[PDB]
Design an enzyme around this catalytic site. Structure first.
Site, PDB file in Angstrom:
ATOM      1  N   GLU B  16      14.914  -8.517  -6.455  1.00  9.40           N
ATOM      2  CA  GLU B  16      14.946  -7.980  -5.108  1.00  9.40           C
ATOM      3  C   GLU B  16      16.213  -8.492  -4.415  1.00  9.40           C
ATOM      4  O   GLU B  16      16.429  -9.695  -4.331  1.00  9.40           O
ATOM      5  CB  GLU B  16      13.670  -8.411  -4.386  1.00  9.40           C
ATOM      6  CG  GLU B  16      13.614  -7.814  -2.989  1.00  9.40           C
ATOM      7  CD  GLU B  16      12.388  -8.111  -2.164  1.00  9.40           C
ATOM      8  OE1 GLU B  16      11.524  -8.862  -2.684  1.00  9.40           O
ATOM      9  OE2 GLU B  16      12.318  -7.627  -1.011  1.00  9.40           O
ATOM     10  N   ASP B 131      31.923 -12.150  -5.793  1.00  9.72           N
ATOM     11  CA  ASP B 131      30.634 -12.834  -5.868  1.00  9.72           C
ATOM     12  C   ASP B 131      30.299 -13.151  -7.326  1.00  9.72           C
ATOM     13  O   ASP B 131      29.158 -12.950  -7.761  1.00  9.72           O
ATOM     14  CB  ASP B 131      29.489 -12.049  -5.224  1.00  9.72           C
ATOM     15  CG  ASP B 131      28.325 -12.905  -4.751  1.00  9.72           C
ATOM     16  OD1 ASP B 131      28.536 -14.126  -4.602  1.00  9.72           O
ATOM     17  OD2 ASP B 131      27.226 -12.376  -4.557  1.00  9.72           O
TER      18      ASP B 131
END
Ligand SMILES: O=C(O)Cn1ccc(Br)cc1=O
Ligand SMILES: O=C(O)Cn1ccc(Br)cc1=O
Ligand SMILES: O=C(O)Cn1ccc(Br)cc1=O
Ligand SMILES: O=C(O)Cn1ccc(Br)cc1=O
Ligand SMILES: O=C(O)Cn1ccc(Br)cc1=O
Lengths: 262, 302
Positions: B16, B131
């Site tokens: 998620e 990232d």
């Protein structure tokens, strides 16, 4: 150094060259638009120039939005009462792509003077994404300009700003500029700028990079020179106003050359 | 794209994000196992989030065996489904569960070489990742490893302009970002990979700081506090303070003791202060560290 990506700039240039061709609008779509004209388009782009300054947006965002608009109007017929809505969504999408701090959707609604609803902006946003198939990382005139700039001996800020200015003028006028690729207009803009400010011409090093010569650039260069000479007479003035600002070294105040000798 | 939700059968939740949920799913017609990322276009008065607009636009373009493939985008009026190639695990979960006595050196070298290929490809297509961390590196059963999670990525111009400063998970964040520099570039991804290389050797983060200033300090304490000699311009940087303690540089033999001479060389080049001197992914592929990597190049997906 690394900010100019020495190890990747050629790869990138080559890739943008390939992509500007895929992202290219149909040169003749305006004739196939029953209800909109080059003049209406010019009015929209001039307005988007003003929205970019009102919200202190990047020039790149402006170019992207034009790219989206022109590709959209290449497959979708649009009634004149809706052209602004397309433009607004284009600007929203481009802002979300390019900006650190995009204006909220509400502001995009507000600048339309309640012509359209938030729902209509968001629904059109969806439509544009569909039509472009999320293909948003389009090469702009600017992406080429900034690379060509690395070939100035030495860097001159008036040259750079003037090249940016000329480039932006080209967004206004579908005829003739729809027929020229970003990389070529940028080439023309950079040469005109360089010639105007320093008397110099398109460098050989850029002939090596781009494969373009004054020969190949000539058609575009003649159009750009005319656009420059007639700019104070154009119906749309927002770009000249913008380039009076010190931010851009007040380059719109420089006099165009009367001849190119080309 | 040519897909409809009717053709997928959900299998289980697998993750998620701050922008929705991922399920493992199966294509009922082809058999293909996929990962479906749901992006609710609703639950948002701003329409399609920018993270999604960049992820799709950028991944559509990045077809490389060491970049997770975006297979499709199903665009309902209510919801948005990104269909991704499925890989069973991430590099973080592998190190925490199976690499307890360590990742063996052949595997580290294979993974790093693949990560560099993927990253070089990004850079070659004017995409910064921004990232890179073990959680965002997927591994499959065939031993491929792939850059994933492009929701913080960005298409750059040349030269670069000022971009978002809140970038990169802290432990992996480059000094030039920490010091508030106006411009950053491909060198920030290389740093993150540097951090990751070290992490794969030791199974623990190299610079696990708990704030920006603590992060910098941990970096300085390992690599020495940078000055004009090692990094011209450093002391003029916006968030550089004269008051910074001046720590000495430590031999990389003491930073990652198990690492051999070639490894230590490559690592130091990834963690160079000056982003201008830091190695590129392209250059790093030819480093001697990789001389004896022979894992066959993974094949790209359709
Ligand atoms: O208000 C008008 O005169 C109509 N109109 C509105 C908005 C834009 Br942009 C152009 C234009 O002609
Ligand atoms: O609203 C209209 O029909 C007139 N109009 C409005 C907006 C724009 Br942009 C152009 C134009 O001709
Ligand atoms: O669209 C839905 O009904 C929601 N949905 C869709 C697809 C999968 Br897999 C799981 C799920 O909950
Ligand atoms: O990593 C992403 O961007 C989305 N994604 C893709 C593939 C897998 Br497996 C998990 C997942 O979250
Ligand atoms: O002793 C050395 O050769 C250097 N050195 C020092 C400390 C550690 Br731990 C490892 C190492 O190689």
């Amino acid at each position: 150094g690394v900010n100019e990506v020495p190890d990747y700039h050629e790869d990138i240039h080559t890739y943008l060259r390939e992509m500007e061709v895929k992202c290219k609008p149909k040169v003749g779509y305006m004739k196939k638009q029953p209800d909109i004209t080059n003049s209406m388009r010019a009015i929209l782009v001039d307005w988007l120039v003003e929205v970019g300054e009102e919200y202190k947006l990047q020039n790149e965002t402006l170019h992207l939005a034009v790219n989206y608009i022109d590709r959209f109007l290449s497959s979708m017929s649009v009634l004149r009462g809706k052209l602004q809505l397309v433009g607004t969504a284009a600007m929203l999408l481009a802002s979300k792509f390019e900006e650190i701090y995009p204006p909220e959707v509400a502001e995009f609604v507000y600048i339309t003077d309640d012509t359209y609803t938030k729902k209509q902006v968001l629904r059109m946003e969806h439509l544009v994404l569909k039509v472009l198939a999320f293909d948003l990382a389009a090469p702009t005139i600017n992406q080429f300009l900034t690379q060509y700039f690395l070939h100035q001996q030495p860097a001159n800020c008036k040259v750079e700003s003037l090249a940016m200015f000329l480039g932006e003028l080209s967004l206004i006028d579908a005829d003739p500029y729809l027929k020229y690729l970003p990389s070529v207009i940028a080439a023309a803009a950079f040469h005109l700028a360089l010639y105007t400010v320093t008397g110099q011409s398109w460098p050989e090093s850029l002939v090596q990079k781009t494969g373009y010569t004054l020969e190949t650039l000539k058609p575009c260069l003649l159009d750009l020179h005319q656009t420059y000479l007639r700019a104070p007479q154009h119906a749309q003035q927002s770009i000249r106003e913008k380039y009076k600002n010190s931010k851009y070294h007040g380059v719109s105040l420089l006099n165009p050359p009367e001849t190119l000798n080309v | 794209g040519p897909g409809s939700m009717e053709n997928f059968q959900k299998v289980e939740k697998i993750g998620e994000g701050t922008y929705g949920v991922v399920y493992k799913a199966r294509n009922k017609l082809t058999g293909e196992v996929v990962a479906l990322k749901k992006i609710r276009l609703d639950t948002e008065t701003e329409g399609v989030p920018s993270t999604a607009i960049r992820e799709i636009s950028l991944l559509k373009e990045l077809n490389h065996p060491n970049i997770v493939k975006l297979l499709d985008v199903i665009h309902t009026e209510n919801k948005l489904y990104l269909v991704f190639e499925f890989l069973h695990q991430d590099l973080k979960k592998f190190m925490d569960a199976s690499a307890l006595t360590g990742i063996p050196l052949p595997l580290i070298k294979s993974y790093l070489f693949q990560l560099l290929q993927g990253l070089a490809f990004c850079h070659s297509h004017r995409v910064l990742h921004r990232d890179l961390k073990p959680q965002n590196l997927l591994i499959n059963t065939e031993g491929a490893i792939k850059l994933a999670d492009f929701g913080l990525a960005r298409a750059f111009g040349v030269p670069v302009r000022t971009y978002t400063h809140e970038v990169v998970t802290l432990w992996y964040r480059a000094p030039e970002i920490l010091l508030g520099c106006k411009y950053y570039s491909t060198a920030v991804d290389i740093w993150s990979l540097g951090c990751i290389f070290a992490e794969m050797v030791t199974r623990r983060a190299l610079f696990p700081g708990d704030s920006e200033i603590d992060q910098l300090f941990r970096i300085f304490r390992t690599l020495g506090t940078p000055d004009e000699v090692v990094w011209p311009g450093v002391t003029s940087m916006p968030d550089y303070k004269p008051s910074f303690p001046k720590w000495a540089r430590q031999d990389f033999s003491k930073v990652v003791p198990p690492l051999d001479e070639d490894g230590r060389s490559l690592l130091s080049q990834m963690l160079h202060y000056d982003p201008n001197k830091r190695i590129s992914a392209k250059a790093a592929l030819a480093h001697p560290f990789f001389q004896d990597v022979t894992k066959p190049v993974p094949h790209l997906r359709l």
